[PDB]
Write a protein that binds this ligand. Sequence first.
Ligand SMILES: [Zn+2]
Length: 157
Amino acid sequence: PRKLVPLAYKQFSPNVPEKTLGASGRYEGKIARSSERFKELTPNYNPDIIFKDEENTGADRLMTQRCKDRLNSLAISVMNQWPGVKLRVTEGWDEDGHHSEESLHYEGRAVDITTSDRDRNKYGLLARLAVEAGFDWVYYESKAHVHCSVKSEHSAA
Ligand SMILES: [Zn+2]
């Protein structure tokens, strides 16, 4: 086994920019409910994940299949890491323009996460678990959350 080293505040892994092919790849444009690409999004109702849903719209649950798969893997690892604690999503798909101009939040490929107990001291390790869970980019963006994203299925050729 390898020793698990938490990410430090503002560290990102892999250590390259988010929207490079070695990480989560390109911005593909905003997804709105009326978009054809809204069909890229699937609602995550994993009982072992808490969703903040501050907008009261269920947007936080709507994400791409790859995002869902990586998040679901991480959910198991979080419960393993801290028995009694669960993975929590505080911001998923954003319909409201609350990020920078070309955010993967706008297309359901990024989630901001915490632990269910909101113990900020756990977040560096949470970030390392997100890397181990296979998220394509993980960024300890604020003391209050870890930003995790995935690539799209649209660079296969
Ligand atoms: Zn984020």
